[PDB]
Amino acid sequence: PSKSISRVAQELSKYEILKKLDESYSSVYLCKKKGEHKRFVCKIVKPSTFNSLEFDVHILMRNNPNFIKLHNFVFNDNGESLLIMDYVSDGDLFDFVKMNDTRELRLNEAACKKIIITLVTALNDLHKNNIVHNDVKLENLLYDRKKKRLFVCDYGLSRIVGTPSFYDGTTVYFSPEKIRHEAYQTSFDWWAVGVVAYEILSTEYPFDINMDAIEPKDMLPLYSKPLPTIEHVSKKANDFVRRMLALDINSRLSTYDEIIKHPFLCF
Amino acid sequence: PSKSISRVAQELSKYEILKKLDESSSVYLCKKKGEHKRFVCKIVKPSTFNSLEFDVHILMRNNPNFIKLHNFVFNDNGESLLIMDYVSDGDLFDFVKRLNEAACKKIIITLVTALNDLHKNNIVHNDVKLENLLYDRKKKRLFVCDYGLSRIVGTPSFYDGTTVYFSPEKIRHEAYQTSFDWWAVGVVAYEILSTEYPFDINEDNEEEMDAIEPKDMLPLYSKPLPTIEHVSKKANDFVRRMLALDINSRLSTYDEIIKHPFLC
Ligand SMILES: Nc1ncnc2c1ncn2[C@@H]1O[C@H](COP(=O)(O)O)[C@@H](O)[C@H]1O
Ligand SMILES: Nc1ncnc2c1ncn2[C@@H]1O[C@H](COP(=O)(O)O)[C@@H](O)[C@H]1O
């Protein structure tokens, strides 16, 4: 009606920037409507860098409590594009394993079990759409010890199942198959889940590294070495991460059903 | 900073609605301040937008046979907007209601190539038809349009789109797959080469085309395809194999299709 256009300019003119939240293709800011309380997150993406599938993940998972609702989104071919989303938490799983722990953050085995069940279930829900998250890692799993609610975030590297893969994302989370340029598949996400599970359970990275120069093929020798036992977690928890990170996919929990039926995740 | 919001709002404020484009989602012709180039602004109803429509636009940005998207505004509690190129005042349907074989061969090669490029993303258009193929008669240029029913390969299917373009496999509720698009291409190819619908129903009787159930298409595919009189034997062989009921007798893949003598 031509009021829509100016309403878009009117609505998205209410938002005011409070701070920069992140540390690049994108930058994330704390936002707020003038005179209104609720805090949002406004993500500004550079021109000619947007992964259109990031929009789909928000929409497809709108009704899943472990994904982040998208309130507004403006894409411009010849400029910046905006995503205005909920602010869900100040913390993430990396905060609970990092070396600088001034706030006495810890995740015991029970907390890891619950997080992993939620993560696996949430990623499975996404996978029903034949989309993979493709950058699952501690920094993209928001969590705080008051809500204790897990939010999967940053769908900017999401991909359609079956398409040719390339070396996007974080190398040290690459599955053997992604290193070998196999098509995007759910097993990519499940391997990253395995690394996350090892990290929150042990507070250490599974494989033998200290790193800007680490390359995908450098990971393969490391995957061939024994996975260290996590000393102070259960035998079931150890058996879980071993089978999550088996080099041979034919010995690995590489599917939803395999993962969710393992003793560790059962009660 | 906040300057980015101002600029983002500013860019979209340059567009002005000129007129609506139907007597029938609503599509409008739009103009931009400082451009003679026209655009198409498509306002989609809240709650019913297929997110993948946006992806097809973006993924096919550099393909000349898809429509370029310039802006997209989404509001979870409002109306969403797509601002895209205005490419043509008509489509292959309007244009068929006298294409010679050579002209049809070019259109088919272009369409098959364009759709193959889309299929590299494991996306299927899923509503290929004459009315969704815009055609600039001046430049003989083809544009695939209306990605509102696009789907990802391997997801379960339902009876969306246009029944009379449904493949045997879509009628049988197989998962979405490239062959859905290729069957529709076969119908398009038959239509432009012959000016007629291949199967034994009155395509000018609207009520009947709209009412026919998917299951009732399958007996029609059993019948032999009428020969197209004044086109090549190669052309006739092409449409015959594009629309073979038995998929083992059908050109159901890009490599199969593009290697047929008619397209060589
Ligand atoms: N919905 C959100 N709510 C709260 N913090 C967020 C949110 N999204 C991103 N952040 C923070 O901003 C950082 C960079 O954004 P991103 O990588 O896109 O998640 C994240 O690692 C979080 O620290
Ligand atoms: N770029 C365009 N140029 C001219 N007519 C269009 C254009 N886009 C859409 N239309 C008309 O609007 C319908 C649907 O809009 P669309 O979203 O572009 O598929 C088409 O089937 C045409 O009738």
Q: Which residues in chain B are followed by a discontinuity, with C-to-N distance exceeding 2.5 angstroms?
A: 24, 97
Task: Name the 3-class secondary structure at B59.
Answer: helix
- CB within 8 Å of A2: residues ≥ 6 apart: B16, B17
With a Cβ cut-off of 6 Å, ligand 1 is lined by A 21-22, 26, 28, 41, 43, 68, 85-89, 139, 142, 153-154
**CB-based burial label for B80 (10 Å; 0-12, 13-18, 19+):** buried
Contact list, B52 vs chain A (CB under 8 Å): 56
Closest alpha carbon to A44 in A94, A82, A5: A82
- CB within 8 Å of A205: residues ≥ 6 apart: A172, A195, A198, A199
d(CA A219, CA A205): 13
Instruction: Give chain A's length.
Output: 267
Q: What is the largest CA-CA distance in chain B?
A: 66
| Structural contact between residues B20 and B28, judged by C-beta atoms closer than 8 angstroms | yes
Q: Phi and psi (nearest 5°) for A36? A: -120, 150
* Closest Cα to atom 3 of ligand 1: A87
Torsion-angle region of residue B252: left (phi > 0), alpha (psi -120 to 50) or beta?
alpha
Q: Phi and psi (nearest 5°) for B167? A: -75, 160
Contact B76 A82 (CB under 8 A): no
Q: Compute the radius of gyration of chain B from its Cα atoms.
A: 20
d(CA B117, CA B178): 11
What DSSP assignment string belongs to B119-151? HTTTEE----SGGGEEEETTTTEEEE---TT-E
Which single residue is written with the structure tokens 């529709």? B184
- CB within 8 Å of A258: residues ≥ 6 apart: A252
d(CA B28, CA B42): 6
* Mutate: best of A3, A6, A8, partner B, most B CBs <10 A: A8
Residue B227 burial (CB count, 10 A): 11
Please give the helix or strand (H or E) that residue B207 lies within, else none: helix B206-211
Q: Closest residue of A to B19, CA-based?
A: A1
| Structural contact between residues A143 and A115, judged by C-beta atoms closer than 8 angstroms | yes
The 3-class secondary structure across chain A, one letter per residue, is CCHHHHHHHHHCCCEEEEEECCCCCEEEEEEEECCCCCEEEEEEECCCCCCCHHHHHHHHCCCCCCCCCEEEEEEECCCCEEEEEECCCCCEHHHHCCCCCCCCCCCCHHHHHHHHHHHHHHHHHHHCCCEECCCCCHHHEECCCCCCCCEECCHHHCEECCCCCCCCCCHHHCCHHHHCCCCCCHHHHHHHHHHHHHHHHHCCCCCCCCCCCCCHHHHHHHHCCCCCCCCCCCHHHHHHHHHHCCCCHHHCCCCHHHHHCCHHHCC
Distances (CA, A) of B228 to B66, B189, B218, B235: 30, 11, 21, 8
Distances (CA, A) of A33 to A4, A82, B156: 19, 15, 41
Task: Name the 3-class secondary structure at B71.
Answer: strand
Q: Is A41 annotated as a binding residue?
A: no
d(CA A156, CA A173): 16
Distances (CA, A) of A44 to A84, A88, A158, B2, B122: 9, 18, 17, 10, 28
- Encoded tokens for A255: 């599917």
- Encoded tokens for B40: 């198409």
Distances (CA, A) of B187 to B96, B130, B204, B223, B264: 13, 9, 15, 15, 20
Instruction: Give chain B's length.
Output: 264
* Mutate: best of A4, A21, A126, partner B, most B CBs <10 A: A4
| Structural contact between residues A172 and A214, judged by C-beta atoms closer than 8 angstroms | yes
Q: What is the resolution of this structure in A?
A: 2.0
Look up residue B40 and give its DSSP letter: E
Q: What is the largest CA-CA distance in chain A?
A: 66
d(CA B38, CA A255): 49
d(CA A196, CA A205): 8
- CB within 8 Å of A200: residues ≥ 6 apart: A93, A96, A97, A107, A111, A112, A115, A116, A138
Q: Hey, what long-range contacts does A141-144 have (CB within 8 A, 24 or more apart)?
A: A141/A92, A141/A93, A141/A115, A141/A196, A142/A88, A142/A89, A142/A91, A142/A92, A143/A89, A143/A91, A143/A92, A143/A93, A143/A96, A143/A115, A144/A89, A144/A90, A144/A91
Closest alpha carbon to B168 in B215, B131, B205, B210: B215
Distance from residue B82's CA to the centre of ligand 2 (Å): 11
d(CA A202, CA A230): 6
Q: Closest residue of B to A2, CA-based?
A: B17
d(CA B46, CA A3): 16
Residue B52 C-alpha, separation from nearest chain A C-alpha, in angstroms: 7
d(CA B199, CA B225): 7
Torsion-angle region of residue A192: left (phi > 0), alpha (psi -120 to 50) or beta?
alpha
d(CA B50, CA A189): 25
Q: Is the dihedral of CA A202, A205, A208, A210 positive or negative?
A: negative
The bridge status of strand B123-124 relative to strand B151-152 is: antiparallel
| Structural contact between residues B30 and B15, judged by C-beta atoms closer than 8 angstroms | yes
CA A128 to chain centre: 17
Q: Closest residue of A to B152, CA-based?
A: A130
